[PDB]
Amino acid sequence: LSTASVLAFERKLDPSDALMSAGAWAQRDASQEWPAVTVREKSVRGTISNRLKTKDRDPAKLDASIQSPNLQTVDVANLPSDADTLKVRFTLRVLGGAGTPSACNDAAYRDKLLQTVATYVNDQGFAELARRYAHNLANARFLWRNRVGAEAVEVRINHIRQGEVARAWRFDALAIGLRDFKADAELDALAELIASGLSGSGHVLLEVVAFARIGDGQEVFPSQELILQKSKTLYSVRDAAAIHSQKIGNALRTIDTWYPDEDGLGPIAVEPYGSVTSQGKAYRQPKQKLDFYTLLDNWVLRDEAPAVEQQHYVIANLIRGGVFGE
Amino acid sequence: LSTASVLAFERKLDPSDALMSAGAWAQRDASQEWPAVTVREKSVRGTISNRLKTKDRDPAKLDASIQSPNLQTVDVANLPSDADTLKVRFTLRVLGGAGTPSACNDAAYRDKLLQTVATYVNDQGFAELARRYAHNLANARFLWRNRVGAEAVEVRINHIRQGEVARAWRFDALAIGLRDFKADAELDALAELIASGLSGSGHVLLEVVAFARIGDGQEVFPSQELILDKGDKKGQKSKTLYSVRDAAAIHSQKIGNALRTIDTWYPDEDGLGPIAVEPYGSVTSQGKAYRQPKQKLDFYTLLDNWVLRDEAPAVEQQHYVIANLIRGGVFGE
Amino acid sequence: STYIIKEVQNINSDREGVKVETTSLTSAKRIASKNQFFHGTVLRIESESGNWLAYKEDGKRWIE
Amino acid sequence: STYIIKEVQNINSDREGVKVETTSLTSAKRIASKNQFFHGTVLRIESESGNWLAYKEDGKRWIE
Amino acid sequence: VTDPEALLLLPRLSIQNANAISSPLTWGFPSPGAFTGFVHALQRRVGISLDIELDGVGIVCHRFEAQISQPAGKRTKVFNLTRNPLNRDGSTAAIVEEGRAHLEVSLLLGVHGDGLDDHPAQEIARQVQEQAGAMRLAGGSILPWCNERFPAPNAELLMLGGSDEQRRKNQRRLTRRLLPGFALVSREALLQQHLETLRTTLPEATTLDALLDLCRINFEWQVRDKPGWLVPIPAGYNALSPLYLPGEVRNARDRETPLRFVENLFGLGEWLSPHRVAALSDLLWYHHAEPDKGLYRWSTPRFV
Amino acid sequence: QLVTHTLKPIHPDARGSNLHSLPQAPGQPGLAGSHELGDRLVSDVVGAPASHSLAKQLYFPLPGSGYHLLAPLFPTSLVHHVHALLREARFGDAAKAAREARSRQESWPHGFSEYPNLAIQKFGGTKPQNISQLNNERRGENWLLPSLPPNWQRQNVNAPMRHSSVFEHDFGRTPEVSRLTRTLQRFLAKTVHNNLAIRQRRAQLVAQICDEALQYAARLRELEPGWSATPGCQLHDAEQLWLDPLRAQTDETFLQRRLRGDWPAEVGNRFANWLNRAVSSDSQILGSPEAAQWSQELSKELTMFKEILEDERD
């Protein structure tokens, strides 16, 4: 019973674009019609800050470059003239059927996978993954630079059912530990709702709206769009700044903390081979048996159930979805 | 009496492109001017997570690839800032004369085929195929990813007669079983209308409009347009979505293929639901082709036997053969 | 002859590549295939400039 | 070919120019460079009409 | 070139996934033969029921939208192909060349049958439109006119009766609704004129078409001027082999008529606004065949 | 084998009778075909006439006779000939210098022709060798010619009710008319020697202006549901009468009543003045022979233009 050369799993928990706006912390109770932050252009005089080879460089060569600097145009987004609070609004949907494979070459493999998934669900539910996801949704971990140096960050996660707000929730990213997961009644309720949606007990829609105190006329750091002079290109939708769907889903999936290093990095995004771009190192290297592909191959062909931690990581990967096999 | 080296049957039930728009479910009934969804461009920065080939004894080599990400451009379609309901509108026509062959080398073969078709119709009508198609049209089975994760899907089929007046209907895809076919007054009426159109009533036009609740700012998934031109330089997009009149849509054949997913008599019939009516029971997603030629259930073999030897196969095989003839194609050699 | 060997998921993508500095392009193709780190990647050989020299899909033969 | 050679501090300006009546643009360019009356001026070649044919900055190469 | 008694004008006929190649060396608007044969196939079925005669077919293209993408490597565009189903062997399908596009066109059907007077004109028009809707023109489905606005009916008008004043008023009324689109006509006068003009240099026909259909630049610099839009078209198919009895040609789809191997023949057509044309009858395309020579052309002779 | 037609590039499964060559030239002088060359025939080696389903057989009607099916083939010699003729033009050091001269403005004796909007077609797909007479470089390198009508490129139509386009609506400048006006205004500098040919190109260029103008109004009326009151109605009153919407259900019956008894006659004057101001002329040349023909052409064009709108209201 070999594997299928073609294997794909549709991603789950796919959110939508995140719109941004500005306003006054006082008006936080009423936040509608606020004008969006429009990107603008400003000239910046380029400078030589790169590390040049001392062997190639010389005293005259340096004075030559700084003599005629290379001008470069960039794009920046700043809050309105009078605005001290930034607002971000993005929705989230729960599709479900994570273990259900989208396409498989062999039927036996698909049946074995569905059986293993049903067995795992029966033994223990997704409540653990839902609880971990609840913390990430509650806190502002999704923000990369806007969160750093913020006075007050307030997240509001509502529940949209049949077009109405079934139940609202309000949390505090600052109060909630960034590197520590603490239990709360609201977090448990949200985790239960997510587990139900994933299990297929009903449609689940959550509208997350965050309000972060940055400062008057501050400069927000939106997602820079790919370049085709103009060097920095910001991604604007309908003349409004936003964050990429994948850019949000990457932070929202920071649930991988069982790496073999136990360093101070903290939450790591679920990615095959535990690759990290910023750190430049990939934990869970293929040499070990903890790799996702090896764990799934063993638990499928040899029916070897790995540690609960590895099983959770494998289920998280299947939920995120991707392309496997060959 | 040998077969004809050249055999072709014009396809029937050929739909057109499906326009899409976004709006509020409350105004969907009273507002049909919903603006179309315009395609947009986005950039993604991902790592290479594919399976490794070289030995895993080189840890540094792996970390190196991680330092270099993968950059590409794609196309996405998202609803307007304030829109939670997606609308899709597409028409369908019924030509008729499925059994009537378009071209045949020998006249005797054509006459025998017409006689067998008339005999089958007299014995039992196409009401079975019409009923199966009615379920597909009523439900959202045509949608591949838009249906998954939907709050409420409402389909409305309008029979456009000589005038604007029509018998507009309203169904529920969620309430209707996806893997089970149940009888209903509206389904029977639709099947009768389809059978009449196929029999040659004179004119049949059905405008199907669907409204699916997805969410504010959600992303629709249109049919990617194949290009096949890799190009000699960079500065191109890796994913191109099919768009007409600056509006996203789904291919006509891509819609007509899903709508005709009534082939449930395949030999395996083990967990799989409806499948597209195609020769050799090929499946792209599953990558397997049921009804292999080695068996006697093959469409070509069954038709050859029922024509030359006049052997009437099981009612299921006859239904499948009539469905394939309705779909149309090129057979023989 | 300096040739930049790059790897990407789809034939259409931008990524840095290693400089082989090989004598001939065919030699470059063989070296790239030997150094492939992946099964689903699309090998793309490019010169020092922005002109694309050649590409090879995972399930397809070399193309120029 | 009548070409109007003009000199200005910045590419954006409205100053009159001499009519060379040269055969090709390369001739007008070589003439402007050989007879350049200023170091920091920006050469601007234009046809008899108001259409700008080409420009050249003090520290930059010819551009069209 | 029979004088048509009446003319039926199809207001708007949409087509999807039509044939946009029309020729081995050219691509674009479909060959006129596809439209001419269509009216012929309709007359063979409805002509007997309604006792009407259709010999002239006018073509007016209102909207043409192809499916092409321009690559970044070169300035030559490419078409958007489709995905073929998996082969019976289970291996991946083979990619094949194909074309698709959205074509909104209006056809003029010349009614030469005297029996039209014996039946209502509106009923004849509706009966013809009903078959035209179910029919497939150019190789694709014909999407009827259905939208928020009211539908567009087919109008048949007799051009035989009435004074020249009424005839001109009718032609103006028709051009008023046919202005958004451009008509199609065959122009062989300029083609033969240029052929004889450049015959001294070399007797090459394809070279003349290639030179005419391109951006010509003259040394001064200057660009050559044309009075109107001129483009090559498939005037017809020339006979490449002698006629063979139905038995001689193997795998023939019919034993009633003999098979003949033919080749491709190009030409030069011109796009002129309907207001430019004076007589509408000159727009209708008439198929002419020669039994001796295998030359078969749909060019409208009355246009010259 | 050597043949002038093959089914390998046309279809992979296409098999049938391939003619060795054309013994006679059936192509008439009135048209252009492969039979008109009779030379430069290139036939490569592939790898009871019979046909196949993919032969694309099509019936042809006959006057008062039966039907004849035609099974066309894929011309290879003509295709290769046209391909080489266009390759030597687009490429080569000879044509290369020609295009470079255009940028330098040098009046080089040779003239280079361009082929915009070209299309590429691949033969054999993954296995180009399967195609007959298709070499390694010749496979998929065969480019076609664009036959799309000039109206293939369609853009949006915008007619707002504000003053931004209310004042400039009368002009309606379009990229199609902009390229024609530059060619038309270039024929006014010709001397008496060039006045012989100017009597045809300039005469034909006037009709194209009215044609491109009427198309804009037609597309506007066929895309905009209507236009309400707008600012700048002093000179724009005549333009608003070009595109007439239907009377609204909630409106009065005095809108159509006033427009019914009024004929659009100022549109011609506004168009004539617009063209006069758009195209430059010389004052001293008013008493020359060119001015007479220019006024005659403008009058002939204005007459047909006014006549076209006269039947619109009536």
mmCIF file of N, CA and C in Angstrom, chain F residues 142-220:
data_model
loop_
_atom_site.group_PDB
_atom_site.id
_atom_site.type_symbol
_atom_site.label_atom_id
_atom_site.label_comp_id
_atom_site.label_asym_id
_atom_site.label_seq_id
_atom_site.Cartn_x
_atom_site.Cartn_y
_atom_site.Cartn_z
ATOM 1 N N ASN F 142 5.677 28.975 -35.852
ATOM 2 C CA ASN F 142 4.822 29.518 -36.920
ATOM 3 C C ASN F 142 3.863 30.530 -36.315
ATOM 4 N N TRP F 143 4.018 31.792 -36.697
ATOM 5 C CA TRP F 143 3.161 32.866 -36.180
ATOM 6 C C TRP F 143 2.097 33.199 -37.206
ATOM 7 N N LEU F 144 0.907 33.511 -36.728
ATOM 8 C CA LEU F 144 -0.224 33.872 -37.592
ATOM 9 C C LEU F 144 -0.370 35.390 -37.693
ATOM 10 N N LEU F 145 -1.428 35.841 -38.360
ATOM 11 C CA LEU F 145 -1.704 37.279 -38.534
ATOM 12 C C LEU F 145 -3.034 37.630 -37.885
ATOM 13 N N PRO F 146 -3.140 38.799 -37.234
ATOM 14 C CA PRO F 146 -4.373 39.175 -36.576
ATOM 15 C C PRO F 146 -5.422 39.663 -37.567
ATOM 16 N N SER F 147 -6.605 39.058 -37.509
ATOM 17 C CA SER F 147 -7.739 39.428 -38.376
ATOM 18 C C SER F 147 -8.851 40.087 -37.561
ATOM 19 N N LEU F 148 -8.603 40.429 -36.306
ATOM 20 C CA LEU F 148 -9.652 41.004 -35.448
ATOM 21 C C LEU F 148 -10.146 42.304 -36.072
ATOM 22 N N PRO F 149 -11.446 42.623 -35.968
ATOM 23 C CA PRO F 149 -11.924 43.871 -36.492
ATOM 24 C C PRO F 149 -11.436 45.067 -35.688
ATOM 25 N N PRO F 150 -11.350 46.275 -36.275
ATOM 26 C CA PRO F 150 -10.833 47.417 -35.540
ATOM 27 C C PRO F 150 -11.592 47.683 -34.231
ATOM 28 N N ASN F 151 -12.812 47.179 -34.113
ATOM 29 C CA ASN F 151 -13.633 47.366 -32.897
ATOM 30 C C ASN F 151 -13.391 46.252 -31.880
ATOM 31 N N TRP F 152 -12.387 45.416 -32.082
ATOM 32 C CA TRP F 152 -12.109 44.309 -31.149
ATOM 33 C C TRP F 152 -11.771 44.858 -29.772
ATOM 34 N N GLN F 153 -11.053 45.969 -29.712
ATOM 35 C CA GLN F 153 -10.651 46.571 -28.424
ATOM 36 C C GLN F 153 -11.753 47.516 -27.990
ATOM 37 N N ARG F 154 -12.534 47.095 -27.003
ATOM 38 C CA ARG F 154 -13.656 47.914 -26.506
ATOM 39 C C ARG F 154 -13.334 48.399 -25.104
ATOM 40 N N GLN F 155 -13.615 49.668 -24.855
ATOM 41 C CA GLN F 155 -13.355 50.293 -23.544
ATOM 42 C C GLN F 155 -14.682 50.726 -22.937
ATOM 43 N N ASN F 156 -14.624 51.253 -21.725
ATOM 44 C CA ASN F 156 -15.858 51.670 -21.036
ATOM 45 C C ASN F 156 -16.375 52.977 -21.618
ATOM 46 N N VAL F 157 -17.625 53.285 -21.311
ATOM 47 C CA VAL F 157 -18.245 54.557 -21.757
ATOM 48 C C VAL F 157 -18.630 55.355 -20.515
ATOM 49 N N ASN F 158 -18.160 56.593 -20.436
ATOM 50 C CA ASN F 158 -18.427 57.446 -19.264
ATOM 51 C C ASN F 158 -19.018 58.772 -19.724
ATOM 52 N N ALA F 159 -20.248 59.069 -19.325
ATOM 53 C CA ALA F 159 -20.878 60.382 -19.580
ATOM 54 C C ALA F 159 -21.530 60.853 -18.282
ATOM 55 N N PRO F 160 -20.813 61.614 -17.438
ATOM 56 C CA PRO F 160 -21.358 62.061 -16.178
ATOM 57 C C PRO F 160 -22.223 63.310 -16.274
ATOM 58 N N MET F 161 -22.855 63.664 -15.159
ATOM 59 C CA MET F 161 -23.739 64.846 -15.092
ATOM 60 C C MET F 161 -23.024 66.065 -14.502
ATOM 61 N N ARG F 162 -21.760 65.945 -14.132
ATOM 62 C CA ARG F 162 -21.019 67.072 -13.530
ATOM 63 C C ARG F 162 -20.451 67.951 -14.639
ATOM 64 N N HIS F 163 -19.631 68.931 -14.278
ATOM 65 C CA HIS F 163 -19.008 69.846 -15.267
ATOM 66 C C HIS F 163 -17.690 69.303 -15.799
ATOM 67 N N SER F 164 -17.176 68.219 -15.227
ATOM 68 C CA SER F 164 -15.860 67.701 -15.653
ATOM 69 C C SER F 164 -15.921 67.313 -17.127
ATOM 70 N N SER F 165 -16.922 66.535 -17.510
ATOM 71 C CA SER F 165 -17.067 66.081 -18.908
ATOM 72 C C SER F 165 -18.230 66.790 -19.589
ATOM 73 N N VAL F 166 -18.955 67.661 -18.904
ATOM 74 C CA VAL F 166 -20.070 68.403 -19.543
ATOM 75 C C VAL F 166 -19.522 69.362 -20.601
ATOM 76 N N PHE F 167 -18.455 70.072 -20.287
ATOM 77 C CA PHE F 167 -17.849 71.036 -21.230
ATOM 78 C C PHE F 167 -17.086 70.328 -22.349
ATOM 79 N N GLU F 168 -16.407 69.235 -22.022
ATOM 80 C CA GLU F 168 -15.574 68.518 -23.014
ATOM 81 C C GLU F 168 -16.339 67.379 -23.687
ATOM 82 N N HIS F 169 -17.613 67.192 -23.381
ATOM 83 C CA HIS F 169 -18.429 66.140 -24.027
ATOM 84 C C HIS F 169 -18.584 66.407 -25.522
ATOM 85 N N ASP F 170 -18.677 67.671 -25.908
ATOM 86 C CA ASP F 170 -18.906 68.013 -27.328
ATOM 87 C C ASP F 170 -17.771 67.438 -28.173
ATOM 88 N N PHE F 171 -16.544 67.483 -27.667
ATOM 89 C CA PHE F 171 -15.396 66.973 -28.441
ATOM 90 C C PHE F 171 -15.427 65.451 -28.536
ATOM 91 N N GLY F 172 -15.486 64.756 -27.407
ATOM 92 C CA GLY F 172 -15.486 63.287 -27.389
ATOM 93 C C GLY F 172 -14.258 62.674 -28.031
ATOM 94 N N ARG F 173 -13.073 63.142 -27.659
ATOM 95 C CA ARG F 173 -11.824 62.632 -28.265
ATOM 96 C C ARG F 173 -11.637 61.166 -27.904
ATOM 97 N N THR F 174 -11.331 60.346 -28.898
ATOM 98 C CA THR F 174 -11.127 58.898 -28.703
ATOM 99 C C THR F 174 -9.782 58.506 -29.301
ATOM 100 N N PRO F 175 -9.108 57.472 -28.775
ATOM 101 C CA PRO F 175 -7.812 57.092 -29.315
ATOM 102 C C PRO F 175 -7.871 56.720 -30.802
ATOM 103 N N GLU F 176 -9.011 56.226 -31.280
ATOM 104 C CA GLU F 176 -9.155 55.884 -32.712
ATOM 105 C C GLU F 176 -9.186 57.130 -33.593
ATOM 106 N N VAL F 177 -9.938 58.144 -33.187
ATOM 107 C CA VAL F 177 -10.029 59.398 -33.980
ATOM 108 C C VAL F 177 -8.737 60.201 -33.836
ATOM 109 N N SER F 178 -8.031 60.045 -32.716
ATOM 110 C CA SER F 178 -6.808 60.847 -32.495
ATOM 111 C C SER F 178 -5.759 60.430 -33.526
ATOM 112 N N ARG F 179 -5.677 59.117 -33.806
ATOM 113 C CA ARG F 179 -4.659 58.659 -34.787
ATOM 114 C C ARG F 179 -5.057 59.055 -36.206
ATOM 115 N N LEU F 180 -6.363 59.132 -36.476
ATOM 116 C CA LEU F 180 -6.829 59.567 -37.819
ATOM 117 C C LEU F 180 -6.632 61.065 -38.048
ATOM 118 N N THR F 181 -6.849 61.877 -37.019
ATOM 119 C CA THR F 181 -6.742 63.349 -37.183
ATOM 120 C C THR F 181 -5.293 63.681 -37.519
ATOM 121 N N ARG F 182 -4.343 62.931 -36.927
ATOM 122 C CA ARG F 182 -2.923 63.280 -37.194
ATOM 123 C C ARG F 182 -2.578 62.950 -38.645
ATOM 124 N N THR F 183 -3.116 61.845 -39.165
ATOM 125 C CA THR F 183 -2.878 61.512 -40.592
ATOM 126 C C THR F 183 -3.587 62.483 -41.530
ATOM 127 N N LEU F 184 -4.783 62.927 -41.159
ATOM 128 C CA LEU F 184 -5.548 63.871 -42.014
ATOM 129 C C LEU F 184 -4.871 65.245 -42.038
ATOM 130 N N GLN F 185 -4.360 65.698 -40.892
ATOM 131 C CA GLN F 185 -3.759 67.050 -40.837
ATOM 132 C C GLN F 185 -2.382 67.039 -41.506
ATOM 133 N N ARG F 186 -1.830 65.862 -41.816
ATOM 134 C CA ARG F 186 -0.522 65.773 -42.506
ATOM 135 C C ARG F 186 -0.624 65.952 -44.018
ATOM 136 N N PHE F 187 -1.824 65.939 -44.579
ATOM 137 C CA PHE F 187 -2.019 66.074 -46.040
ATOM 138 C C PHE F 187 -2.247 67.527 -46.445
ATOM 139 N N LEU F 188 -2.250 68.455 -45.492
ATOM 140 C CA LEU F 188 -2.454 69.889 -45.805
ATOM 141 C C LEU F 188 -1.137 70.592 -46.138
ATOM 142 N N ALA F 189 0.006 69.946 -45.928
ATOM 143 C CA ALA F 189 1.327 70.548 -46.206
ATOM 144 C C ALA F 189 1.833 70.181 -47.599
ATOM 145 N N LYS F 190 1.088 69.385 -48.351
ATOM 146 C CA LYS F 190 1.530 68.969 -49.693
ATOM 147 C C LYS F 190 1.435 70.146 -50.654
ATOM 148 N N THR F 191 2.366 70.222 -51.586
ATOM 149 C CA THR F 191 2.383 71.312 -52.576
ATOM 150 C C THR F 191 1.428 70.973 -53.715
ATOM 151 N N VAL F 192 1.467 71.759 -54.780
ATOM 152 C CA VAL F 192 0.597 71.519 -55.960
ATOM 153 C C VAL F 192 0.947 70.179 -56.604
ATOM 154 N N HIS F 193 2.212 69.800 -56.603
ATOM 155 C CA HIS F 193 2.643 68.522 -57.210
ATOM 156 C C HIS F 193 1.952 67.349 -56.518
ATOM 157 N N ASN F 194 1.736 67.444 -55.215
ATOM 158 C CA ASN F 194 1.123 66.346 -54.434
ATOM 159 C C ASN F 194 -0.394 66.495 -54.353
ATOM 160 N N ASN F 195 -0.973 67.473 -55.033
ATOM 161 C CA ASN F 195 -2.434 67.695 -55.000
ATOM 162 C C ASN F 195 -3.185 66.638 -55.821
ATOM 163 N N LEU F 196 -2.499 65.896 -56.685
ATOM 164 C CA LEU F 196 -3.182 64.876 -57.503
ATOM 165 C C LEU F 196 -3.677 63.713 -56.644
ATOM 166 N N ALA F 197 -2.809 63.135 -55.827
ATOM 167 C CA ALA F 197 -3.182 61.988 -54.973
ATOM 168 C C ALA F 197 -4.004 62.449 -53.776
ATOM 169 N N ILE F 198 -3.810 63.686 -53.343
ATOM 170 C CA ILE F 198 -4.508 64.196 -52.134
ATOM 171 C C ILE F 198 -6.016 64.208 -52.389
ATOM 172 N N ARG F 199 -6.445 64.146 -53.644
ATOM 173 C CA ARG F 199 -7.879 64.183 -53.983
ATOM 174 C C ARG F 199 -8.589 62.892 -53.583
ATOM 175 N N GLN F 200 -7.853 61.827 -53.279
ATOM 176 C CA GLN F 200 -8.457 60.524 -52.917
ATOM 177 C C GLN F 200 -8.271 60.197 -51.434
ATOM 178 N N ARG F 201 -7.045 60.249 -50.938
ATOM 179 C CA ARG F 201 -6.796 59.887 -49.529
ATOM 180 C C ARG F 201 -7.509 60.880 -48.610
ATOM 181 N N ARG F 202 -7.403 62.167 -48.906
ATOM 182 C CA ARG F 202 -8.056 63.188 -48.067
ATOM 183 C C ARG F 202 -9.573 63.056 -48.173
ATOM 184 N N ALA F 203 -10.079 62.722 -49.357
ATOM 185 C CA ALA F 203 -11.533 62.564 -49.547
ATOM 186 C C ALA F 203 -12.049 61.390 -48.719
ATOM 187 N N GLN F 204 -11.323 60.281 -48.720
ATOM 188 C CA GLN F 204 -11.755 59.074 -47.980
ATOM 189 C C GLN F 204 -11.576 59.288 -46.479
ATOM 190 N N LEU F 205 -10.601 60.101 -46.075
ATOM 191 C CA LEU F 205 -10.329 60.282 -44.633
ATOM 192 C C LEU F 205 -11.448 61.078 -43.967
ATOM 193 N N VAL F 206 -12.173 61.894 -44.731
ATOM 194 C CA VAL F 206 -13.298 62.669 -44.142
ATOM 195 C C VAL F 206 -14.431 61.753 -43.682
ATOM 196 N N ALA F 207 -14.767 60.753 -44.482
ATOM 197 C CA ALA F 207 -15.873 59.838 -44.140
ATOM 198 C C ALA F 207 -15.518 59.075 -42.871
ATOM 199 N N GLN F 208 -14.254 58.681 -42.723
ATOM 200 C CA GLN F 208 -13.867 57.870 -41.546
ATOM 201 C C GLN F 208 -14.072 58.701 -40.280
ATOM 202 N N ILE F 209 -13.849 60.012 -40.365
ATOM 203 C CA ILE F 209 -14.073 60.864 -39.168
ATOM 204 C C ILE F 209 -15.545 60.825 -38.728
ATOM 205 N N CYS F 210 -16.461 61.004 -39.671
ATOM 206 C CA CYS F 210 -17.902 60.946 -39.317
ATOM 207 C C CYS F 210 -18.261 59.538 -38.830
ATOM 208 N N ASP F 211 -17.652 58.524 -39.430
ATOM 209 C CA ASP F 211 -17.965 57.134 -39.036
ATOM 210 C C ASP F 211 -17.525 56.897 -37.593
ATOM 211 N N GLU F 212 -16.298 57.284 -37.261
ATOM 212 C CA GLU F 212 -15.788 57.073 -35.889
ATOM 213 C C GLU F 212 -16.579 57.941 -34.911
ATOM 214 N N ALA F 213 -17.063 59.100 -35.351
ATOM 215 C CA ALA F 213 -17.851 59.980 -34.471
ATOM 216 C C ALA F 213 -19.221 59.379 -34.159
ATOM 217 N N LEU F 214 -19.909 58.874 -35.175
ATOM 218 C CA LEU F 214 -21.265 58.312 -34.968
ATOM 219 C C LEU F 214 -21.157 57.091 -34.054
ATOM 220 N N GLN F 215 -20.064 56.332 -34.166
ATOM 221 C CA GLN F 215 -19.936 55.105 -33.346
ATOM 222 C C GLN F 215 -19.879 55.484 -31.870
ATOM 223 N N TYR F 216 -19.198 56.581 -31.552
ATOM 224 C CA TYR F 216 -19.140 57.015 -30.138
ATOM 225 C C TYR F 216 -20.538 57.329 -29.599
ATOM 226 N N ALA F 217 -21.333 58.073 -30.363
ATOM 227 C CA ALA F 217 -22.706 58.401 -29.906
ATOM 228 C C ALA F 217 -23.531 57.120 -29.780
ATOM 229 N N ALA F 218 -23.359 56.198 -30.721
ATOM 230 C CA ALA F 218 -24.134 54.943 -30.684
ATOM 231 C C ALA F 218 -23.781 54.153 -29.428
ATOM 232 N N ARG F 219 -22.492 54.001 -29.150
ATOM 233 C CA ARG F 219 -22.061 53.225 -27.968
ATOM 234 C C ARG F 219 -22.533 53.943 -26.710
ATOM 235 N N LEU F 220 -22.528 55.273 -26.716
ATOM 236 C CA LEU F 220 -22.965 56.028 -25.526
ATOM 237 C C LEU F 220 -24.446 55.773 -25.259
#
